Symmetry: D3
Subunit: 67 residues, 6 copies
């Protein structure tokens, strides 16, 4: 119910922990890949792991268009 209009359901296939940030790579429907860099705290708090089923969220105003 949050306004972010892009919610892409997917599966974690890559995970890399840094000191402050984290990188979560999801395999989503149709064969596309989504790359997320978020805080390492949210990554540990949400219990993300390779194979977990997750949703990638993106606010519309953060989406560019390439012709």
């Amino acid at each position: 119910s949050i306004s972010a209009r892009n919610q892409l359901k997917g599966k974690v296939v890559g995970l890399k922990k840094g000191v402050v940030t984290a990188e979560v790579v999801l395999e989503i429907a149709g064969g596309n890949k989504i790359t997320s860099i978020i805080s390492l705290d949210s990554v540990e708090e949400l219990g993300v792991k390779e194979g977990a089923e997750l949703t990638a969220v993106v606010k519309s105003t953060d989406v560019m268009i390439l012709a």
Copy 2:
């Protein structure tokens, strides 16, 4: 060749022009929908129209994770 790690190839199915911004809705592979709000200038300059084939770009650091 730009760093934005999320490039989702798709087809414009919705277009709405505002005064300063624009909303471009793409149908992408696998049946997902992407919603873009960008400037109405880039929308007119790139020549976006319903049915055009476009790529949605999203910088990794703008992607959240929902468990």
Copy 3:
């Protein structure tokens, strides 16, 4: 259950609808005013109105420090 680490509860004191986006000002702890600019579409589906209790959400990576 989203990685976005900042989630500030409040009540809607401001609502302005545009053509593509819309403005939502929430009053949070301490009378602090939070202003959110989102899609017109999102406000309508989330049924936002003056007095509604909603939560404002911000990804850490959008949060700057002013000294």
Copy 4:
């Protein structure tokens, strides 16, 4: 500045990485604000625990949860 979200608080956490850094400020009512910025900024503004600072956020970066 144009960013309309400016919240005053007290540094209650600071995590320094290699490129970025986390600052956790406690603002009015016990809410905590998490900010990830550049290490460079954390060295230059003078950020440390106990310090009073303001969290700034651009409106268009704020989502709404119903």
Copy 5:
């Protein structure tokens, strides 16, 4: 402020919508900067053509093209 991108320029365009507004500043070397902010900010900072202002951008929002 922590945002490390602060470019000084002169307002050469201003477009007012209902909720947001476009400001186009000309900075050093003829480059133009496009910024979409809240109408509210455009009314309060005092933005108009000819005015000198600074464009601010957070590092983590800047992409790189090779």
Copy 6:
């Protein structure tokens, strides 16, 4: 050919690699310093190095006005 309206040409004067992200400082017209924090992965694939000419890109919606 991307909607991102700000594209500032420059030469790399700064490069710092982290674990998940990396920092790139470009020198543009007027000696102005632009700092970009992106994914470590992106810097490696784009082969970024001191002295490289690259273009910094920013979406309008991330650009604030300081008075």
